[PDB]
Symmetry: D3
Subunit: 112 residues, 6 copies
């Protein structure tokens, strides 16, 4: 029942090393991430729903885990998540349905 907690913590352990050893790269990346996700015409929660759809489409368990955790923090509802996953399935077929299952599992895990 802690699959995605373990995935995200293991990635974070390595990213801490990147922040130390490639600080210019990680600073640049953070600047891109902050600029992309800031509140604007689309609010942060809406932008994170887009990130989740992309994470599913890219079949990336790590991104699914991190963006799930953020969606819980931003008080996204289960229904908002399900509707975003539906769009991923429309644009990805069978494989995206498989990762949509992973996204629901992650969201439920972090909603604990």
């Amino acid at each position: 029942s802690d699959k995605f907690s373990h995935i995200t913590k293991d990635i974070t352990t390595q990213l801490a090393k990147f922040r130390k050893e490639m600080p210019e790269l990680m600073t640049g990346f953070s600047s891109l991430a902050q600029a992309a996700t800031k509140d604007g015409a689309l609010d942060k929660k809406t932008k994170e729903l887009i990130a989740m759809a992309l994470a599913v489409a890219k079949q990336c368990p790590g991104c699914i885990g991190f963006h799930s955790q953020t969606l819980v923090k931003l008080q996204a509802t289960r229904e908002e998540l399900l509707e975003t996953l539906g769009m991923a399935v429309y644009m990805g077929g069978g494989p995206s349905l498989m990762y949509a299952a992973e996204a629901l599992e992650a969201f439920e895990e972090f909603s604990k």
Copy 2:
């Protein structure tokens, strides 16, 4: 100045043949598409913004063209499009920046 009009019309010519020759497949696909894009907790425009992000991430000129055209129909603003493209670049890097350029070109074309 009609790049995406030509791309979408050429695809539509083939899809008309699919509707005739594989009607069960195309009916099933349409049912999935309608269920995915219907108004709910996320409105149709928001769902189409997600579709556009996915189209950019999938590097699909056809989808970029169709979803651009729909965004114009749903009265999405330029700023809403730019913010969705920003999320694609965050989740895709250089390649997604290239297709974000295509998406802006398509949106401007259909806004004529």
Copy 3:
């Protein structure tokens, strides 16, 4: 030795929730799936071999597991599977060779 049984069962647990909570989406998707896989000019086994190649190309363990299980049910032979995996390697190189290994493991697991 039950890797893919676990993977598929865990996905199925989530899909059961999708069937309850997004029935229109799942009905649409099922309609598309049934239309795509039905006997026609190509038989069901041949279509599942194509699905398995696509699963390997998409590097999707879930799809690999489900389609493996279906290939066993449809009495695909080991040699038919190997020849399909060969085509995936030709069209995908090193990475596809890695997922072809997973597909053989899954097929052997469900053939038990």
Copy 4:
């Protein structure tokens, strides 16, 4: 009306240069291709139908062009092609529908 003839000829012009300048790489690649596509439990036409599905899933106009041309040579029917494209749409959603349209265009072009 010669879109894919032009795409395949332009690629072939470059591949002739690779055959001259990287003969060991091209010989290796040819050996893989021949081993993958040879008649066995699956006949060559069936293997090419698999290649066409993969080409659509990979959104590769070049691959779509070449494999279309080969399918015509191997006397694949329009209906066998359509059914293969249906499997790609099932495993790829909207983006694969867009490239399925390209595949039908290519098949019709080389059927002239």
Copy 5:
């Protein structure tokens, strides 16, 4: 004979708009790009060869065009490019061979 000059110029026209309208996003992205490509344990030419391999693997004509142009600027040789494309084919199969052809075309175009 000016295919990639056109592709890159058309993308650059849109990116100029992004620089004006999303300056924080483009500044962040530029910071990431500069940090990634700067001389270090690997020199700039070596890093651009890696970028070209990734562009081919990502089947991105735009990236192929830009990175080709930069490789010429950095005085990469034809043989260094060919060897990089060989690695892409090994890791990508048929589809990568198709985009390796595009990369050679782009390199020859910007070497004029």
Copy 6:
């Protein structure tokens, strides 16, 4: 602490079966791999750095494991690896950052 040793060993077990049962395919694939990775204008270590970038971009844990192991054998430095991973992040965004973390974990595992 043996995640990638386990992944690579499990794949190798299946590949041994492919070598026995599909020797023509595996011989062809080996010929391509040897031609691609041989010393030339780029040395073997440089070519493996390219393979590692591609493995990250393709989000392939198997490929990441094998190419990590080879990089250790070819005496690649940690800094050369980091810089290669930086290029992958530049060309892939968030998802590539997640697999770069996996690559660093693999490299550290095989450096033991």
